[PDB]
Design a protein around this ligand. Sequence first.
Ligand SMILES: Cc1cc2nc3c(=O)[nH]c(=O)nc-3n(C[C@H](O)[C@H](O)[C@H](O)COP(=O)(O)OP(=O)(O)OC[C@H]3O[C@@H](n4cnc5c(N)ncnc54)[C@H](O)[C@@H]3O)c2cc1C
Ligand SMILES: O=c1[nH]c(=O)c2[nH]c(=O)[nH]c2[nH]1
Length: 389
Amino acid sequence: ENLYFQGHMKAIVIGAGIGGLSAAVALKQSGIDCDVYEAVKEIKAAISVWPNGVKCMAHLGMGDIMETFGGPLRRMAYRDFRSGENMTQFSLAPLIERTGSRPCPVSRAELQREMLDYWGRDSVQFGKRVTRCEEDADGVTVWFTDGSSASGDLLIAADGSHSALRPWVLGFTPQRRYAGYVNWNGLVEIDEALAPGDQWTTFVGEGKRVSLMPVSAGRFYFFFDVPLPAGLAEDRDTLRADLSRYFAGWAPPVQKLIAALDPQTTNRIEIHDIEPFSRLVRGRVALLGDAGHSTTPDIGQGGCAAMEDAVVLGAVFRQTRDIAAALREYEAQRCDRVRDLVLKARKRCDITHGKDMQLTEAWYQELREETGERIINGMCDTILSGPLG
Ligand SMILES: Cc1cc2nc3c(=O)[nH]c(=O)nc-3n(C[C@H](O)[C@H](O)[C@H](O)COP(=O)(O)OP(=O)(O)OC[C@H]3O[C@@H](n4cnc5c(N)ncnc54)[C@H](O)[C@@H]3O)c2cc1C
Ligand SMILES: O=c1[nH]c(=O)c2[nH]c(=O)[nH]c2[nH]1
């Protein structure tokens, strides 16, 4: 009856990705007991964690993970696809000073592992795939495909971009929108024949991108973007040849990358987003992370946004036990932010990948005249609009 006492407030968190584990950690900080449920039986290339996300991780008590595994990112450059020459290059030092943290690219595998380690695998029930939630005046209940169910006071749906709970919260089923390009990504060992080990290097041209950024342990996170129709007959077996075709004529470092990579460990993903929602919560249930907002990766803010969601979620429960009031405040704080992030990503996606090839050529022109000041400013804007400023 006094809801502050241990065992009187139970949150059910669905999903053990970045969002779910962040949310559980944040809820626990605010004195709420969480049971975490995850669909897959076992976990299974990288994420750029900008300073807004880093400060969130620090706030959540998980700062050591970022310091330890974050790649040494200190500068960036854009290179011409033919010449391979610098169009613009500059250090990120100024951004790090304005935002208060260094950027931390981290391998997805390592980030996930460390966060599970931190939360503790024993407090996660795997093979638990949620199908339905229902709420009464007393609480909320969810059902799992294996026939079990669980009840609690609060439900956090952090079940990803294909969220099963999302339709119940919204009242309809949003659909994923193909963003018009395909991303190939993976990891390779740092070889300065490709690019500098402390910088994020992107080759641009023809509405395409080839990118390298350092994660931990002397490795590069790499990705290739190509504007393409969805559904092409292309997989890991067709991979090297596909990339060779798509990037014919591109500077030698790119050919070096295509030869260096391992197709068996390289991901090919057709990029989608979802039109932003105007609601994130319903009763005792809140969407968090990709479940509440699904963006293209184009400004590297997807995982950061889920961390931001969690920080705000913990904060709204810090000094209240009125679930309905807390979740309305969560929604109030998050909804405009994640809308802007999805739309910002979308716009950048469209400029980068030649939706209008002239706008794209104009962007390349701006990169030729770029000192770094305008880009740094733009990045700071995105970062400083986060909950921890
Ligand atoms: C190619 C690419 C590059 C990216 N780069 C960046 C970047 O540089 N920086 C950045 O900040 N973000 C980046 N992102 C975005 C980032 O990866 C995601 O936003 C982030 O992983 C979302 O976390 P999440 O927990 O909400 O979703 P997920 O990581 O997808 O986790 C959801 C979890 O829920 C589980 N689940 C699904 N359905 C059910 C069910 N019904 N019942 C129970 N559990 C279920 C899933 O198994 C999964 O473990 C990138 C994304 C992509 C695709
Ligand atoms: O602009 C991008 N930033 C990223 O952090 C990222 N990650 C990715 O796969 N594609 C992109 N694009």
